């Protein structure tokens, strides 16, 4: 057991490991506020963490659990890893608070497109890192559902990160599927994401940039095309159906035409993630071996994950079920290299 230290930062106690000093808050980030700190072990700057209110509720305990449980899993360069988890309390009974630190980050994807104007080098590796960290997470049987610019995290050498949360509408990015609220619904929807990216990063301008989502739903049938009969046989839905039917067909563009200027593999990429047809969307594995990513794909260098148990998705527990399952994480965690 580590000393602890206790400090009054702007709203809460902080009471963390010696180890961590020169607390620093950056700010309100996914769900807790977030100092960064000097960990005088390493010699090197992190984020840590600490958690809002983590057992609240049933919502917020379990959400507590699933977020210290994947961060504990994803061991990838492309993902964002967990560096130590701790809690000052000392026993189940006093378990009330979790810190999470991991490596400081600084800036995302939509810090870094707003000022500048990407080349095709850049927007080569920039999407290679995520379709690398994408396959990674989709070999654990894990969908992100939420892949967005400011879900991603680039450092000054252009790497980058996929994160659980924020250091941008949802609804830019997301697949129509979801739009629809069709159950079941595949990883592709994350490929989809990936495609509004893409495209954002190539053209500096929001792909889809919906009011709502039926507006959303409009802008994404003005560029891919209304849906061939193979697939509105699919949608069960009668409102979405007629929404579907209803105004004057506006046919495939040309995405040769919309992406005018951009290397033309980048453009075939784009065709390929997005289609409407989640069954015929390009994975994350296939995108990598497609030549736009010549320059970067290794297929001895891209690697998949333990498969990842999250049976307890399925299951209604009690607070202090949750909590407990969250204290065994904590206390059974082993630090990285
Ligand atoms: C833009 C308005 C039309 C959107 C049509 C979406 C096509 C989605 O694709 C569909 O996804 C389903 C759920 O994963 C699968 O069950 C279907 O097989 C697949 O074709």
Redesign the pocket.
Known sequence: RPTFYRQELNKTIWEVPERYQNLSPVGSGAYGSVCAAFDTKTGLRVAVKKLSRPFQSIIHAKRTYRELRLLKHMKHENVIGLLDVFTPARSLEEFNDVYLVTHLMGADLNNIVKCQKLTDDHVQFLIYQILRGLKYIHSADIIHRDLKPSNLAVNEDCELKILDGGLVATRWYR???I??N?????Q??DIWSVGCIMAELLTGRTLFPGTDHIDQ?KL??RL?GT?GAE?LK??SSES?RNY?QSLTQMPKMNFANVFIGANPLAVDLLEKMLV?????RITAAQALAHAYFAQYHDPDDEPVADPYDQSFESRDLLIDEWKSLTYDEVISFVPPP
């Open positions: 697949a129509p599927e739009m629809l069709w159950m079941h619904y595949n592709t929807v739903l994404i049938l891919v849906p697939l699919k949608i979405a579907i409407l047809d989640s069954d015929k």
